[PDB]
Design a protein around this nucleic acid. Sequence first.
RNA 1: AGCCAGUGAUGGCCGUGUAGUGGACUGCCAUGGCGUUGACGGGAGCGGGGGAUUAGGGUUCGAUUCCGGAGAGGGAGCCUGAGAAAUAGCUACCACUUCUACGGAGGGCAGCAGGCGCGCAAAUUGCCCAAUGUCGAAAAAAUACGAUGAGGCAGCGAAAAGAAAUAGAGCCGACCGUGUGGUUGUUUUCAAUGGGGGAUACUCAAACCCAUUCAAUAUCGAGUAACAAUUGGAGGACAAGUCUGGUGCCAGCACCCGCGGUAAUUCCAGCUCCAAAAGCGUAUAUUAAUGCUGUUGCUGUUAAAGGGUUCGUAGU
RNA 2: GAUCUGGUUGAUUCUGCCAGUAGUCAUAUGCUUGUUUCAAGGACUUAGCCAUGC
Lengths: 140, 72, 55, 61, 179
Amino acid sequence: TKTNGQHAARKLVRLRRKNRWADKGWKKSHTFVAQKANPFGGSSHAKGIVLEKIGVGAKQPNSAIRKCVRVQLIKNDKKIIAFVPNDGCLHFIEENDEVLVSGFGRSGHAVGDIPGVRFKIVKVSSVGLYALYRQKKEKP
Amino acid sequence: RGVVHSTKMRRSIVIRRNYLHFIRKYQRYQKRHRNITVHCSPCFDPKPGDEVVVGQCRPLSKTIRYNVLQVV
Amino acid sequence: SLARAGKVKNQTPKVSKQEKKKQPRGRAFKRLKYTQRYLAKTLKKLRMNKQPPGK
Amino acid sequence: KFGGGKTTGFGLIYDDLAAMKRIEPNYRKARLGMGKKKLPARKSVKERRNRNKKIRGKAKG
Amino acid sequence: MRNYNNFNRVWKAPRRPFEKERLDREMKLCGQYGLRCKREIWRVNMTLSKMRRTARLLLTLPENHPRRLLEGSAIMRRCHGYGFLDEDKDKLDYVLSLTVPDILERRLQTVVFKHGLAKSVHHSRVLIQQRHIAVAKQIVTIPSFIVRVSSEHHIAFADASPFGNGRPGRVKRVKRNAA
RNA sequence: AGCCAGUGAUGGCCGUGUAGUGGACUGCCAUGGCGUUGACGGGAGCGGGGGAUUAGGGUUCGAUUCCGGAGAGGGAGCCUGAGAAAUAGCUACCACUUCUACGGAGGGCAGCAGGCGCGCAAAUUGCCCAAUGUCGAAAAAAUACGAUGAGGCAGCGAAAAGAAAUAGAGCCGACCGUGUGGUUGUUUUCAAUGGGGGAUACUCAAACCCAUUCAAUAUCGAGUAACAAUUGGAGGACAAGUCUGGUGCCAGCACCCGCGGUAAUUCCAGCUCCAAAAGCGUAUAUUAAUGCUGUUGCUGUUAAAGGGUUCGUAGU
RNA sequence: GAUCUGGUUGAUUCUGCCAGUAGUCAUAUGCUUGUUUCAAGGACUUAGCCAUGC
Ligand SMILES: [K+]
Ligand SMILES: [K+]
Ligand SMILES: [K+]
Ligand SMILES: [K+]
Ligand SMILES: [K+]
Ligand SMILES: [Mg+2]
Ligand SMILES: [Mg+2]
Ligand SMILES: [Mg+2]
Ligand SMILES: [Mg+2]
Ligand SMILES: [Mg+2]
Ligand SMILES: [Mg+2]
Ligand SMILES: [Mg+2]
Ligand SMILES: [Mg+2]
Ligand SMILES: [Mg+2]
Ligand SMILES: [Mg+2]
Ligand SMILES: [Mg+2]
Ligand SMILES: [Mg+2]
Ligand SMILES: [Mg+2]
Ligand SMILES: [Mg+2]
Ligand SMILES: [Mg+2]
Ligand SMILES: [Mg+2]
Ligand SMILES: [Mg+2]
Ligand SMILES: [Mg+2]
Ligand SMILES: [Mg+2]
Ligand SMILES: [Mg+2]
Ligand SMILES: [Mg+2]
Ligand SMILES: [Mg+2]
Ligand SMILES: [Mg+2]
Ligand SMILES: [Mg+2]
Ligand SMILES: [Mg+2]
Ligand SMILES: [Mg+2]
Ligand SMILES: [Mg+2]
Ligand code: NA
Ligand code: NA
Ligand code: NA
Ligand code: NA
Ligand code: NA
Ligand code: NA
Ligand code: NA
Ligand code: NA
């Protein structure tokens, strides 16, 4: 119901400071804890090495194999799972290749029916995965 | 100008200034204060609760920059 | 199992694109679109892409 | 001037040829000829000056 | 790096990218005035917004305010000079009623077509771009040039153009060379 | 949730030191000084003028052109000087590091250009003092031309911003939908213009770009104008197909809802169509959407949320 | 521009979030690129290390 006092500025300032920690959006941007757990060091992209090609089953209502990959990041030696989009496009990737990884669209949240994947492959050997798919370039 | 707060040291007293600070976002005031140490001549005999007028002078000690000019 | 990757894309029969006269560009393109929609017909609701009946 | 038959510039007229040679900059004179010869490139002057910083006396010290 | 030349933007993209009503209205303007893209309409939208935002500020101010007397007469003079408003409207309340077509009619592309030097807005656009039109004996090749009322009776063919007092153009020159 | 005092913590007296005031410092004396109006400790961070988003109130960014501060691998000391605790000055140590005849002697790009490494991530080892300034025994010129990677100029540069091409006007024939006009198509004609090529030349320190011109007696050029527009989409949100093949819960799509097991409006393709366009997708951060942080302006019987009850200080 | 839309039910009216939408002299990456004017450009990580010339 709040004060409304005309000399109660201190009470109002203290009230807003305490109650601003109760929303996840404000807390996440001010806490430095999600940044440390983020495999990317607060960046939009990262480079890594391919360790293995794996198949991830889709969630229950759907039924498919999603053709993901396991990548170790160069900057801090963390392991993640990245999705490889588009038809085929797994034949362009080999073990020990160098890839560029970006996020999905939901800022660290898993998307679609893929269980726990929040990254996707963007470049391989510094050519461009979608360009290879449309045959505009050849893999070096 | 200020209010005498304590007269424990030798030839020195502490005065307190009370003022209101305006917070723009809430359009309201809040109370603040500041303590200042000044030099008092023996010709004055202030007691806590009194009102004094002080004037700036050259540095006289580590924290003293004012001198008592009048006791009301 | 990654044995089936690119199955449908490789299976699709290849059909080449057909060659046609080029369209106007720039201001001449907006003129063509405006003529199709508000000229060339005399309304007294228009469908931009209506298809012949099918199965 | 854009799309036209006009031009605008700046002009000076000196009282004597001797006065013109005394005051005009060298590059503006050289457009007419009658200019001083070109000095060597600044790079060569820089290297020679730096080499001379170790020598004393004659031999260009 | 110590460069102090200024620059700014002159247009803004609309919110709600897909409205059937706004899309239909904007297509009508493009075909009626022979414009190249939607950026030309949105450029006019920004200038109208700035004019109306200023007028709203002054009308809130009380009459015979020093700022209203100076700025109010300045904006009214600007609108009368460019032909947006007629001379009988002088209240500063008529600035708020300006519309997009009110400004699109003062473009040089539209004015050339109205005077009769061209057969259509598309013909008039290429005449201006090809250095054939002079406003006050000065060749103007910008279709978005905004014509003042004092210049409206001085538009004619340029003296350097083959349609004026110039030499024959490319087709005649090449034909004569081939002969 | 308490901080400060042996070895200065708060104040006093006589001094020392400084260019000068001062617990700045030596000796003696008293017990003071600060704190829930958040001291002490911890985390992020150079401060400001300002930028982004604009009903209003607000939220967020500011290493970076101007002003102020600090530093020159780390950290300490110092000479000369009117001014430095100076680093393209000196002295020593620590960490790195170069030449040697092995006795010894050197180094400091967070100046310009450039290299290695790091990373998602950022340009030439170019020309010039012509302009703007600084220093100086110094105007310019004449037997007789200061320096300046400060600065300017060009190269590279789809960070961002402004203007703007990719066609215009008709005849004929066959068609369109309203009901002698509005327009689509193929054989056609007839003017115009740049992108480009050049110059009596202009510009410029010189070169370049822009601008002028294709006779002034005397200057090249568009028809499939092959001088050929792209990037995303067509179930809903959200503008645009109940079209035709292939696949058959596979391959794949899908920010969300969802699509795919034999007639797929959603996958892979063809043809049409849509948006905006020399630009257009994707990722991460941030502002508005958000009256989902609410001073203006939220909610609390049952959806999340009134303390078990009284007394009661600071505060209002 | 003082503006909202899709998802909880056999249907209805709510609370509430997830998703959509516009900008950024805000960075990076992909496809594409005819003309002209004006411009930021090894800050982010490593106040990391430096051949050569000035
Ligand atoms: K003293
Ligand atoms: K001196
Ligand atoms: K100079
Ligand atoms: K089928
Ligand atoms: K609420
Ligand atoms: Mg001409
Ligand atoms: Mg810092
Ligand atoms: Mg700053
Ligand atoms: Mg930093
Ligand atoms: Mg900058
Ligand atoms: Mg810099
Ligand atoms: Mg220093
Ligand atoms: Mg260093
Ligand atoms: Mg030093
Ligand atoms: Mg140095
Ligand atoms: Mg450098
Ligand atoms: Mg001299
Ligand atoms: Mg001399
Ligand atoms: Mg410089
Ligand atoms: Mg541009
Ligand atoms: Mg082209
Ligand atoms: Mg040309
Ligand atoms: Mg399709
Ligand atoms: Mg659809
Ligand atoms: Mg629709
Ligand atoms: Mg998206
Ligand atoms: Mg089908
Ligand atoms: Mg917000
Ligand atoms: Mg609001
Ligand atoms: Mg409850
Ligand atoms: Mg109760
Ligand atoms: Mg039921
Ligand atoms: Na800051
Ligand atoms: Na400074
Ligand atoms: Na050193
Ligand atoms: Na870049
Ligand atoms: Na809000
Ligand atoms: Na429910
Ligand atoms: Na040109
Ligand atoms: Na050019």
